[PDB]
Amino acid sequence: APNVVVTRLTLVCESAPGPITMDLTGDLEALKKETIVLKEGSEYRVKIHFKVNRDIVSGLKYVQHTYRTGVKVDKATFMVGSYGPRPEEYEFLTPVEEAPKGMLARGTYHNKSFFTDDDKQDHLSWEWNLSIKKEWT
Numbered sequence: 001a002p003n004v005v006v007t008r009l010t011l012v013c014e015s016a017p018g019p020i021t022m023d024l025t026g027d028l029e030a031l032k033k034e035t036i037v038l039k040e041g042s043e044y045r046v047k048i049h050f051k052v053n054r055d056i057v058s059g060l061k062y063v064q065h066t067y068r069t070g071v072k073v074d075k076a077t078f079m080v081g082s083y084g085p086r087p088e089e090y091e092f093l094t095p096v097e098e099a100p101k102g103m104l105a106r107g108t109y110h111n112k113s114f115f116t117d118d119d120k121q122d123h124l125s126w127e128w129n130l131s132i133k134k135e136w137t
């Protein structure tokens with residue numbers, strides 16, 4: 001096992017009808033197929049579940065790249081910090097954002113996330129898709 005193990009991504013949205021999450025321990029190619037649904041205008045946060053196993057890690061960063069076909073990447077970096085080893089997993093949450101609204105805002109966005117640190121270590125790099133819809137269905 002590695003020192004840092006990213007286990008789960010969750011979109012914390014209080015107005016959502018059900019859970020919006022994805023297991024990050026399985027196959028990484030199957031993650032692209034899975035599409036995450038977010039109603040337009042919804043307030044949300046990105047939650048990263050991860051474990052520290054042996055030693056204190058420092059300088060953790062969450063890096064998120066959002067792609068729409070034919071558009072320049074929308075980048076965002078979040079400082080995660082230092083964490084010590086323990087059996088229970090940790091939870092890092094981004095600040096609240098508001099998903100865009102309107103027909104021009106609806107559609108599927110292609111995300112590539114990076115859980116890394118100051119040492120540019122690849123704790124986990126994965127792809128996932130987010131669909132902005134007029135309603136939750």
Ligand SMILES: O=C(N[C@H](c1ccc(-c2ccccc2)cc1)c1cccs1)[C@H]1CCCNC1
Nearest residue numbers: 066067068071072073074098099100109111130
């Ligand atoms: O719509 C915006 N950016 C969008 C976007 C859409 C969705 C996300 C996302 C990804 C992952 C999770 C949650 C949400 C991220 C960005 C675009 C990206 C690339 C080309 S446009 C502006 C307008 C108002 C809201 N703040 C930013």
